[PDB]
């Protein structure tokens, strides 16, 4: 069955989080106040490789 290609290409995560006035890290809701969960995006860039597992 077909798989859509939009899974593999997802944008960066910087626009989804912000800082409250009491320095509380809370996430920005776009579709309802129940949209407070983990985004699905861009994990390759904030990363450092293992010392013997090079991949």
């Amino acid at each position: 069955l077909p798989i859509p290609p939009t899974i593999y290409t997802k944008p960066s995560h910087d626009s989804y989080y912000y800082i409250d006035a009491l320095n509380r890290v809370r996430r920005k809701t776009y579709q309802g106040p129940d949209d407070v969960y983990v985004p699905n995006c861009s994990i390759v860039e904030l990363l450092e490789p293992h010392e013997t597992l090079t991949s």
């Binding site: 409250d20 006035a21 009491l22 320095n23």
Partner: protein, 668 residues
Amino acid sequence: AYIAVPAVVDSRSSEAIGLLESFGVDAGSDANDVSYQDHDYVVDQLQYMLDGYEAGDVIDALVYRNWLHHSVYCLLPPKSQLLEYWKSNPSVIPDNVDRRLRKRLMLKKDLRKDDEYNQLARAFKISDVYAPLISSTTSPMTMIQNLNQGEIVYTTTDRVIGARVLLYAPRKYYASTRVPHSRFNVGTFPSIATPKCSVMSGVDIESIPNEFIKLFYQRVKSIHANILNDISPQIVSDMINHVDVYRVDVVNVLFEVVDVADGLRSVSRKLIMHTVPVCILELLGIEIADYCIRQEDGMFTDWFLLLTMLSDGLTDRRTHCQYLINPSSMPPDVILNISITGFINRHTIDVMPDVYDFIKPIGAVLPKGSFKSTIMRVLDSISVLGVKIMPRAHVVDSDEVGEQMEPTFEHAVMEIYKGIAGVDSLDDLTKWVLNSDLVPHDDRLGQLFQAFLPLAKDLLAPMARQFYDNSMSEGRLLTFAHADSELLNANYFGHLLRLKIPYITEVNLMIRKNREGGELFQLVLSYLYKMYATSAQPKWFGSLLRLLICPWLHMEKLIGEADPASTSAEIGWHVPREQLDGFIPYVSIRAPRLVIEELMEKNWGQYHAQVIVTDQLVVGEPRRVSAKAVIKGNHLPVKLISRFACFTLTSKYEMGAAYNARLAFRSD
């Protein structure tokens, strides 16, 4: 002689406090004949013994106790540990026990297998050796007569009362853990034991603060009321002939309402006014003569207003009911002239409330028609020791959260009339809800409250969350607001003080001019806030002003003449490095020299936070810029300041990125 007062007495500190003068007894010679008796231990034994018995048995035992006859307990080890204490050091054995068992205690043999020592120890009981031996289950009435007759009393339990408790054995033997009298002895817990025992009149049972002394005195007045010896303070004075703050002397005044409006004297009403502080009456020069409480436009004279706001509510003398005066000058009754007659009691209260534990903001809840701007203008003009007590610059009005919204909440709830079917105008709504008596119908309020609740739950609460979070970020503030569920639905951090003015609010609503909309709409809206709030019994308003004002007057009496450098202090956040030394004020302290030199070595390095400094300097004269500080760990307890020093409650944060600073002490 024996006299009983409603206070915790000790032989040590009660004379340095000046307790009888604090009740009003004039003993000014200081001929040191009034010997005291410490009652800390009998209050604590009362606390421990109310666990085990009925309060009826407890109080009816404790009453019949001669406090002049000295006696003392000595409690014992248990029955199977007392023989072990008799085994080592066999010299300390009373001559009563047995010549058959004494010879078997005093020998050196290990007595491992006991063939007749087993029988001599099982048949042994303590009751034929020690003569009182109260019990574990003694019905504690008989304890008191045992201590009145003898002077040493043996017991086997802990829950005893009346005297101190000495140990018979050293401390490793247990499994449960003389006095100068000079004929004018005073101290609490009356006695019916002897003639010449007296009980102090004056203060009501209703207004005793310790609540165990109050329970005791309620019982000792509910029985034995005919056989007491009630004497006034003046009779006590004729029979005779680390200074603490947050403990005011307090009286009640006994004025009345009078008119001279036709050139004739005529008394109309009869009033009493509870818990007014003595220091403010000494400040204002209040005496017996005729006073007038209006000036030139119908507004109260700014000292009677401070007097009524400073204390709790009024009370009628004829009906014994709560009374609220008319702030308006339009009479079914008005009060123009009064006349003060006398003062009735002289107890002392802790000004510090129980709810005040940590340094955190204060949320006051008032109704709509409280004297907000006038009480703020009165508290603005107070400056005791160079510091202003409650500045306007960090107090929050009730409508400040309502005026920042773009549909501007009062203007938003003016537009409620379109949802209702048959009113279709604001003036028609204000006519329809009311009776033409200004007490409204309940069904119109129910329909309008069902229309009003989505406006107050949805379009107010997250804006209130953002506002009170912003105000908590920019300092430690004090927020006047309404309808305490406005502080409960929006999650407000800080203390909560439900308060109530001593005046009628609903007539105060419709006197003011140029307010928002019609005054009838303001009164309807006030009723909707009052219906919205809770069912909690609020308080009177007097406690918060007593806390604000009255501790600084004792400090002005104490350290009004020393130096500001060595008697001032300052605490706040402190960041080590220097880029484009850093310090933010958090709390200021006035105290004497010994108190500050005790304050310096306390562990102020436990609490830490995040400190954010911006670059918008403001109109104030020294080089200091606004900032923000957000506390992270635990909060600062008030014991870690003091009981004795006097500090400011609420302040602002004025000195960029985060800094992670830690707070410290500084003085001269």
